[PDB]
């Protein structure tokens, strides 16, 4: 979702001129319109807490009751009070402060070869719940271009069109 | 009408012996692919109408069996096709789950080529429709699952020939 | 036709044809001179009856021809008018057969399976035949327009 339809060129301008901090840049990307259209509108209140704990706080959900406990902040205060409460936890301010971009904290053990399945792959933008209302399909009905006569673009095996162009050499050499 | 387990039990029973290591060796091979066949039969059930719409438009929808005089001209005759192609995509799904093509010749193949000759249905265009239908089925279920579902399509095409 | 199903009716009942059946085969063949004139009018008016037929069809259903519609582009629109030429032809058969028996087993039996399986809106093709009906009945007198229109609306009924 890093498209220039989703770039925030005025949040970027206020970060270059030292007006906002990175904590305000991270807040402005969650409250942005591309994040509400592509992510918030295809999750329920419980899976969206799992997305914003994994990407803002940098760690995984402890258990299925941490999801329940935080999803009522979105339902009663809206999305703007939920990301103020998350950014003002001491878990955030001890790790990233207001000047560091978040990351997935302690994903891989120092001597091992594998990791812990990075969080953009563990939770994509919709899941099993919401996936059914808005997944895509395979072969819908849309009346496409008919490609016209269509075998013939892959000639069928006996047939003398595979040697066309090889007739070509034939003359001189 | 035997699946892979029924065929394994029959051959092990027909000699009156128990299920030795070789009989269970194939049964373990069938249970390993049990997860693949259901998901293959899952998506085929979902895209049944879409697969048949793709096959006819890719094989015999652009032709002169479709035009007047061709074998598929009238709307009753056209409607019989997608009804007819539905069985091939459906019974092939059953063979893919059962892991044994016994159901095809039991319920599809016998009296089939002898029936199309009676009606005058072109067996040549029929097999190419199933071949094109086999080609789109490998699109959905993947490569190896398409290899499994494709293994029963040409079984129909072979016997129907 | 009226001759073939008045037979197969009395065929099934193990009997011959009644006066009610034979005074109508009689009444139909004396009607045969007037039927060929009516079908002769629609025969060499297919250029206008079809092209003006698809005239009102697109003005009333621009979705089917708009981008995304089933009959979109130079290709499908040609086939979009091809089916109307088919159904206009079957109405000429029904007028000469004195019944929708030719239209029944051609273009009507299982028609919803075809058009549903082609992605075509079956309601849209029904709108096309209605537009052809107003052009056809505008080409004939009142005594004839009660027939030529009469076979179209049967096709409208079975096509939905």
């Amino acid at each position: 979702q890093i498209l220039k339809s989703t770039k925030q060129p005025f949040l970027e301008s206020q970060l270059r001129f030292n007006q906002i901090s990175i904590k305000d840049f991270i807040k402005g990307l969650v409250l942005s319109a591309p994040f509400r259209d592509l992510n918030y509108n295809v999750n329920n209140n419980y899976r969206f807490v799992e997305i914003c704990v994994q990407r803002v706080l940098g760690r995984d959900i402890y258990n299925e009751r941490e999801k329940i406990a935080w999803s009522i902040i979105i339902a009663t205060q809206g999305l703007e009070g939920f990301i103020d409460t998350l950014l003002n936890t001491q878990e955030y301010l001890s790790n990233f402060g207001d000047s560091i971009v978040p990351f997935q904290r302690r994903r891989i053990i120092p001597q091992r070869s594998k990791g812990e399945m990075p969080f953009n792959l563990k939770t994509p933008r919709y899941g099993i719940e919401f996936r059914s209302k808005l997944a895509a399909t395979q072969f819908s009905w849309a009346s496409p271009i008919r490609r016209f006569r269509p075998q013939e673009q892959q000639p069928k095996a006996g047939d003398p069109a595979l040697f066309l162009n090889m007739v070509q050499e034939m003359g001189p050499g | 009408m035997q699946d892979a387990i029924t065929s394994v039990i029959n051959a092990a029973d027909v000699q009156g012996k128990y299920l030795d290591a070789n009989s269970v060796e194939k049964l373990r091979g069938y249970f390993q692919t049990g997860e693949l066949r259901v998901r293959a039969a899952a998506t085929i059930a979902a895209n049944a109408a879409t697969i048949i719409k793709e096959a006819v438009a890719k094989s015999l929808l652009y032709s002169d069996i479709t035009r007047p005089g061709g074998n598929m001209y009238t709307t009753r005759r056209y409607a019989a096709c997608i009804r007819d192609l539905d069985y091939y995509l459906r019974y092939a799904t059953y063979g893919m789950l059962a892991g044994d093509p016994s159901i095809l010749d039991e319920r599809v193949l016998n009296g089939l080529k002898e029936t199309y000759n009676s009606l005058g249905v072109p067996i040549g265009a029929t097999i190419q429709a199933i071949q094109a239908m086999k080609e789109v089925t490998g699109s959905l279920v993947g490569s190896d699952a398409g290899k499994e579902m494709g293994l029963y399509f040409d079984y129909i095409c072979s016997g129907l020939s | 036709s009226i001759v073939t199903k008045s037979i197969v009716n009395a065929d099934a009942e193990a009997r011959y044809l009644s006066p009610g059946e034979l005074d109508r085969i009689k009444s139909f063949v004396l009607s045969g001179q007037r039927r060929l004139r009516i079908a002769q009018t629609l025969t060499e008016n297919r250029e206008r009856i079809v092209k003006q037929g698809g005239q009102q069809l697109f003005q009333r259903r621009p979705d089917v021809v708009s981008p995304g519609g089933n009959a979109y582009g130079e290709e499908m629109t040609a086939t979009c008018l091809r089916d109307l030429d088919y159904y206009l032809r079957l109405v000429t058969y029904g007028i000469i057969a004195g019944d929708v028996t030719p239209i029944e087993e051609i273009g009507l039996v299982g028609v919803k399976e075809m058009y549903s399986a082609l992605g075509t809106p079956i309601s849209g093709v029904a709108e096309g035949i209605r537009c052809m009906k107003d052009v056809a009945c505008s080409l004939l007198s009142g005594e004839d327009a009660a027939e030529v229109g009469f076979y179209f609306d049967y096709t409208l009924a079975a096509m939905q």
Partner: peptide
């Protein structure tokens, strides 16, 4: 056997044969 029915001879149709260029 009906108002539309098939006979082999009236079939003028490259579909029993399959030269796909027509």
């Amino acid at each position: 056997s009906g108002y539309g029915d098939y006979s082999y001879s009236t079939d003028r149709t490259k579909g029993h044969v399959n030269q796909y260029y027509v």
